Design an enzyme around this catalytic site. Structure first.
Site, short mmCIF file in Angstrom:
data_model
loop_
_atom_site.label_atom_id
_atom_site.label_comp_id
_atom_site.label_asym_id
_atom_site.label_seq_id
_atom_site.Cartn_x
_atom_site.Cartn_y
_atom_site.Cartn_z
N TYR A 76 -13.21 44.60 57.91
CA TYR A 76 -12.26 43.67 58.52
C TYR A 76 -11.81 44.08 59.92
O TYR A 76 -11.21 43.28 60.65
CB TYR A 76 -11.03 43.50 57.62
N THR A 133 -17.72 41.39 44.88
CA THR A 133 -18.26 40.05 44.66
C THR A 133 -19.15 39.50 45.77
O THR A 133 -20.06 38.71 45.50
CB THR A 133 -17.11 39.03 44.48
N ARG A 249 -7.51 39.42 38.24
CA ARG A 249 -6.86 39.40 39.54
C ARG A 249 -6.19 38.05 39.59
O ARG A 249 -6.66 37.08 38.97
CB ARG A 249 -7.87 39.53 40.68
N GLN A 388 -4.78 42.14 48.31
CA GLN A 388 -5.52 41.76 49.50
C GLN A 388 -4.75 40.57 50.03
O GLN A 388 -4.41 39.66 49.28
CB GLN A 388 -6.96 41.35 49.21
N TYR A 433 -10.03 46.99 52.83
CA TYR A 433 -9.28 45.77 53.19
C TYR A 433 -8.39 46.19 54.35
O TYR A 433 -7.17 46.12 54.28
CB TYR A 433 -8.40 45.28 52.04
C1 LIG Z 1 -16.63 40.33 54.57
C2 LIG Z 1 -16.40 40.67 53.10
C3 LIG Z 1 -15.86 41.95 52.75
C4 LIG Z 1 -15.62 42.34 51.42
C5 LIG Z 1 -15.95 41.36 50.38
N1 LIG Z 1 -15.74 41.62 49.02
C6 LIG Z 1 -15.23 42.89 48.65
C7 LIG Z 1 -15.02 43.19 47.27
O1 LIG Z 1 -15.23 42.39 46.32
N2 LIG Z 1 -14.56 44.49 47.00
C8 LIG Z 1 -14.32 45.47 47.97
O2 LIG Z 1 -13.92 46.61 47.58
N3 LIG Z 1 -14.52 45.17 49.29
C9 LIG Z 1 -14.95 43.90 49.63
N4 LIG Z 1 -15.11 43.66 51.00
C10 LIG Z 1 -14.43 44.58 51.93
C11 LIG Z 1 -15.25 45.45 52.91
O3 LIG Z 1 -15.93 44.57 53.79
C12 LIG Z 1 -16.22 46.36 52.11
O4 LIG Z 1 -15.56 47.02 51.05
C13 LIG Z 1 -16.99 47.38 53.01
O5 LIG Z 1 -16.07 48.17 53.74
C14 LIG Z 1 -17.98 46.68 53.95
O6 LIG Z 1 -19.19 47.45 54.08
P1 LIG Z 1 -20.19 47.13 55.28
O7 LIG Z 1 -20.51 45.67 55.24
O8 LIG Z 1 -21.30 48.08 55.16
O9 LIG Z 1 -19.29 47.42 56.57
P2 LIG Z 1 -19.45 47.80 58.11
O10 LIG Z 1 -18.39 47.08 58.88
O11 LIG Z 1 -20.87 47.66 58.51
O12 LIG Z 1 -19.07 49.34 58.03
C15 LIG Z 1 -17.96 49.79 57.25
C16 LIG Z 1 -17.53 51.22 57.56
O13 LIG Z 1 -18.12 52.36 56.90
C17 LIG Z 1 -19.28 52.73 57.65
N5 LIG Z 1 -20.59 52.54 57.04
C18 LIG Z 1 -21.25 51.46 56.54
N6 LIG Z 1 -22.47 51.74 56.08
C19 LIG Z 1 -22.60 53.11 56.30
C20 LIG Z 1 -23.67 54.07 56.05
N7 LIG Z 1 -24.84 53.73 55.50
N8 LIG Z 1 -23.46 55.38 56.40
C21 LIG Z 1 -22.28 55.73 56.96
N9 LIG Z 1 -21.24 54.94 57.24
C22 LIG Z 1 -21.48 53.60 56.87
C23 LIG Z 1 -19.02 52.14 59.06
O14 LIG Z 1 -19.46 52.97 60.11
C24 LIG Z 1 -17.50 51.80 58.97
O15 LIG Z 1 -16.63 52.89 59.12
C25 LIG Z 1 -16.48 40.10 50.75
C26 LIG Z 1 -16.70 39.75 52.07
C27 LIG Z 1 -17.27 38.36 52.36
O1 LIG Z 2 -12.63 41.21 48.34
C1 LIG Z 2 -12.83 39.99 48.54
N1 LIG Z 2 -13.03 39.51 49.78
C2 LIG Z 2 -13.57 38.15 50.05
C3 LIG Z 2 -13.16 37.77 51.50
O2 LIG Z 2 -13.64 38.72 52.44
C4 LIG Z 2 -13.00 37.12 49.03
O3 LIG Z 2 -13.59 35.83 49.35
C5 LIG Z 2 -12.77 34.63 49.50
O4 LIG Z 2 -12.22 34.27 48.25
C6 LIG Z 2 -11.39 33.10 48.24
C7 LIG Z 2 -10.84 32.86 46.83
O5 LIG Z 2 -10.05 33.92 46.34
C8 LIG Z 2 -12.22 31.92 48.73
O6 LIG Z 2 -11.44 30.74 48.75
C9 LIG Z 2 -12.81 32.21 50.14
O7 LIG Z 2 -13.59 31.12 50.63
C10 LIG Z 2 -13.65 33.47 50.04
O8 LIG Z 2 -14.22 33.82 51.30
C11 LIG Z 2 -13.44 37.61 47.66
O9 LIG Z 2 -12.95 36.72 46.63
C12 LIG Z 2 -12.83 39.00 47.36
O10 LIG Z 2 -13.59 39.61 46.32
#
Ligand SMILES: *Cc1cc2c(nc3c(=O)[nH]c(=O)nc-3n2C[C@H](O)[C@H](O)[C@H](O)COP(=O)(O)OP(=O)(O)OC[C@H]2O[C@@H](n3cnc4c(N)ncnc43)[C@H](O)[C@@H]2O)c(*)c1C
Ligand SMILES: O=C1N[C@H](CO)[C@@H](O[C@@H]2O[C@H](CO)[C@@H](O)[C@H](O)[C@H]2O)[C@H](O)[C@H]1O
Ligand SMILES: *[C@@H]1O[C@H](CO)[C@@H](O)[C@H](O)[C@H]1NC(C)=O
Ligand SMILES: *[C@@H]1O[C@H](CO)[C@@H](O)[C@H](O)[C@H]1NC(C)=O
Ligand SMILES: [Zn+2]
Ligand SMILES: [Zn+2]
Ligand SMILES: [Zn+2]
Ligand SMILES: [Zn+2]
EC number: 1.1.3.-
Length: 479
Positions: A76, A133, A249, A388, A433
């Site tokens: 984020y 998810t 949740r 969140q 988050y």
């Molecule tokens: C956009 C989005 C984010 C979500 C979603 N759903 C989540 C869920 O259901 N549970 C969670 O616990 N988190 C959810 N998240 C939140 C976060 O986006 C994630 O938890 C992760 O932090 C995202 O990972 P990633 O996409 O890899 O993130 P980057 O921005 O590329 O980097 C994050 C971070 O850590 C480092 N990093 C990533 N990959 C590596 C590797 N391979 N080695 C070292 N360091 C790494 C980065 O440098 C940075 O510090 C749902 C949605 C839609």
């Molecule tokens: O950690 C999370 N992060 C993502 C967001 O980064 C959430 O997504 C949202 O969840 C909402 C419902 O809770 C939806 O209405 C919305 O369109 C959808 O993008 C997801 O439910 C949740 O698991």
């Protein structure tokens, strides 16, 4: 060619692919998911191997810039970019191989995303892992911060299944980590966030995909007073009743409060668990979703329009401000204030929208809580709740107001309703988050609370010159 970029020249010399700032690749990989916090990297390397990563790191070192690994780019705060302009970015999504051995151990490359991973795990021995998810999330950032989802109450965080990895250090060396090898670094990678090392490959233990999962949803029609009494009931329930095989949740927005989650069992047994609490919570609700399905099925229940199989062709964006919070059992003041805030302070202009996810994080029966704060870098094992807060601008292309100038107050005040009632040491946040308004000092204490000092000492040992640091990450401070 490396015209006008000395880093690209270095990468070229090491046979490491890169994106010139004038290319479409730069447009894709160089633009953050959250457009409210988009940054301009000094360069973007696209490694295909552990060696490419080390080579890319050396080039970063040669340039004297910080280096940011980007997994799925779903942070984020756009930390895959370093959370600011000027870092060498290592786009890893081209490295997404997933291989499950005869011991059901899964090797997953640092740039793999959850959707693709879940598919491979199912296809290779009908295995599964505990994770979020969103199919687009990168396994990398996810596991480094924890990895929370509908399987956490039953199977803990994604990091509780990590048993090893192959990483590249700040000095470009390549090492292996596990509970018995460089155990201190391994501990840090399990919840410490970014900046400790760049993971080329992860080694996960896995569990067999459950034969049956029952997804559910309870829709309430609660007024102010009913919200308070309902949450109080839900709280006692979460701490003393809620079954291990049940996750939940609360979906909360301006006009609703819905319960949803997965149950590792059958519908009939689930209904017997939901009915008593629905009554205890004061009725005024009904089951709106109750279906038995399988792992693949539950996964496809929470995609929210996102493609399931995502690898390196990803160009999705949003414009929003997020926040989070972890806390222990709450007093009536906190719940009462939280509710009043929703009812009296959540009005937003059309084009703007919000929601809050109230996660049944800890508690007696939560597998997550079966691990102590000392066992991994994750420092919220003692917290019952996780939240969140999501504030979004749907029509950002036309208007982003009140952002970028302001707007943060809305969700910050929302968090404050609960946070202000907690003892300083119990105030926390979940790095996955991320709240971008925090200072590096505020963030460190909130994201890692009791484990901060140890993480700083480990950071000092593995990245003393903070080559991999971002704007809020653990700093190199020796004890
Ligand atoms: C956009 C989005 C984010 C979500 C979603 N759903 C989540 C869920 O259901 N549970 C969670 O616990 N988190 C959810 N998240 C939140 C976060 O986006 C994630 O938890 C992760 O932090 C995202 O990972 P990633 O996409 O890899 O993130 P980057 O921005 O590329 O980097 C994050 C971070 O850590 C480092 N990093 C990533 N990959 C590596 C590797 N391979 N080695 C070292 N360091 C790494 C980065 O440098 C940075 O510090 C749902 C949605 C839609
Ligand atoms: O950690 C999370 N992060 C993502 C967001 O980064 C959430 O997504 C949202 O969840 C909402 C419902 O809770 C939806 O209405 C919305 O369109 C959808 O993008 C997801 O439910 C949740 O698991
Ligand atoms: C996901 O995409 C990869 C590469 O495009 C492909 O090899 C794999 O078969 C896909 N998974 C599916 C749809 O089963
Ligand atoms: C919330 O709204 C109430 C009135 O509905 C107002 O008195 C209060 O100041 C608001 N809280 C904040 C700090 O926004
Ligand atoms: Zn050119
Ligand atoms: Zn630039
Ligand atoms: Zn049970
Ligand atoms: Zn008070």
């Amino acid at each position: 060619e490396a015209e006008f970029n000395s880093i690209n020249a270095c990468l070229a010399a090491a046979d490491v692919e890169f994106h010139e700032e004038d290319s479409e690749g730069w447009d894709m990989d160089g633009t953050a998911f959250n457009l409210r916090v988009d940054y301009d990297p000094a360069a973007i390397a696209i490694p295909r191997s552990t060696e490419d990563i080390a080579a890319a790191v050396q080039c970063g070192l040669d340039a004297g810039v910080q280096i940011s690994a980007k997994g799925g780019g779903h942070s984020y705060g756009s930390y895959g970019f370093g959370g600011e302009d000027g870092h060498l970015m290592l786009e890893l999504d081209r490295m997404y191989r997933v291989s499950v051995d005869d011991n059901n151990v899964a090797t997953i490359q640092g740039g793999a995303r959850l959707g693709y991973t879940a598919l491979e795990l199912l296809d290779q021995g009908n295995r599964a892992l505990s994770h979020g998810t969103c199919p687009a999330v990168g396994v990398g950032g996810h596991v480094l911060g924890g990895g929370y989802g509908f399987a956490t109450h039953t199977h803990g965080l994604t990091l509780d299944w990590l048993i090893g990895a192959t990483v590249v250090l700040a000095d470009a060396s390549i090492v292996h980590v596990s509970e018995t090898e460089n155990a201190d670094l391994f501990w840090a990678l399990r919840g410490g966030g970014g900046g400790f090392a760049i993971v080329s490959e992860f080694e996960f233990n896995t569990f067999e995909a459950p034969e049956i999962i029952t997804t559910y949803q309870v829709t309430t029609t609660w007024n102010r007073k009913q919200h308070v009494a309902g949450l109080k009931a839900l709280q006692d329930w979460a701490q003393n009743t809620m079954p291990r095989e049940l996750s939940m949740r609360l979906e909360i927005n301006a006009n609703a409060l819905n319960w949803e989650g997965n149950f590792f069992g059958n519908a009939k047994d689930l209904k017997k668990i939901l009915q008593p609490i629905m009554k205890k919570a004061g009725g005024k609700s009904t089951i709106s979703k109750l279906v038995e399905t399988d792992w693949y099925g539950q996964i496809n229940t929470y995609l929210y329009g996102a493609d399931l199989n995502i690898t390196y062709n990803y160009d999705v964006h949003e414009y929003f401000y997020a926040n989070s919070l972890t806390a222990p059992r709450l007093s009536d003041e906190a719940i009462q204030a939280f509710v009043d805030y929703k009812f009296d302070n959540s009005s937003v202009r059309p084009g703007r929208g919000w929601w809050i996810q109230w996660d049944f994080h800890g508690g007696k029966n939560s597998a997550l809580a079966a691990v102590s704060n000392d066992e991994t870098a994750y420092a919220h094992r003692d917290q019952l709740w996780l939240w969140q807060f999501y504030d979004s601008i749907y029509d950002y292309e036309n208007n982003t107001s009140p952002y970028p100038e302001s707007g943060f107050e809305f969700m910050q005040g929302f968090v404050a309703t609960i946070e202000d009632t907690l003892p300083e040491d119990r105030k926390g946040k979940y790095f996955n988050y991320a709240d971008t308004t925090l200072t590096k000092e505020e963030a460190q204490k909130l994201y890692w609370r009791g484990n901060l000092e140890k993480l700083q000492a480990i950071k000092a040992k593995y990245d003393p010159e903070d080559v991999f640091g971002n704007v809020v990450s653990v700093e190199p401070i020796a004890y």
